[PDB]
Design goal:
0% strand; 130 residues; de novo protein; globular
Length: 130
């Protein structure tokens, strides 16, 4: 069906978790919160799903993000422990909650690394190109 395609997004959860290793686990949730939220600031189709979850829960579309960010972080720490299958099952809930494609989550992780460095205003060692 789509398990094989979900494996491709789960590779980024392995890559990102070793990229952020040695930080505080609660901070990862706060970095993911704004990183997953940026997709709704960039696209109305994500933001209208934030409204559906918040209206089902009786809250604001900003408040469901705290719960959405846990799901991704639990996929990263599982992927760091070598558990790619529970990481896949943990992304299934996150991509389904926002109604998004695994390649769109593969885009979200690329915002996560761009906002991680912004806590210090640093830049990545992108010296493999140009």
């Amino acid at each position: 069906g789509d398990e094989r395609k979900l494996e491709e997004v789960t590779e980024e959860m392995r890559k990102m978790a070793e990229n952020m290793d040695g930080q505080d686990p609660e901070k990862v949730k706060e970095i993911v919160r704004r990183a997953l939220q940026q997709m709704a600031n960039d696209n109305p189709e994500v933001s209208e799903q934030l409204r559906e979850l918040a209206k089902r829960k009786g809250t604001s579309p900003s408040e469901v993000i705290k719960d959405l960010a846990e799901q991704v972080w639990r996929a990263m720490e599982r992927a760091r422990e070598g558990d790619k299958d529970t990481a896949r099952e943990l992304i299934r809930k996150f991509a389904d909650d926002l109604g998004i494609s695994p390649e769109q989550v593969k885009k979200f992780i690329k915002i996560m690394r761009e906002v991680q460095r912004k806590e210090d205003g640093s830049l990545e060692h992108h010296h493999h190109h140009h």
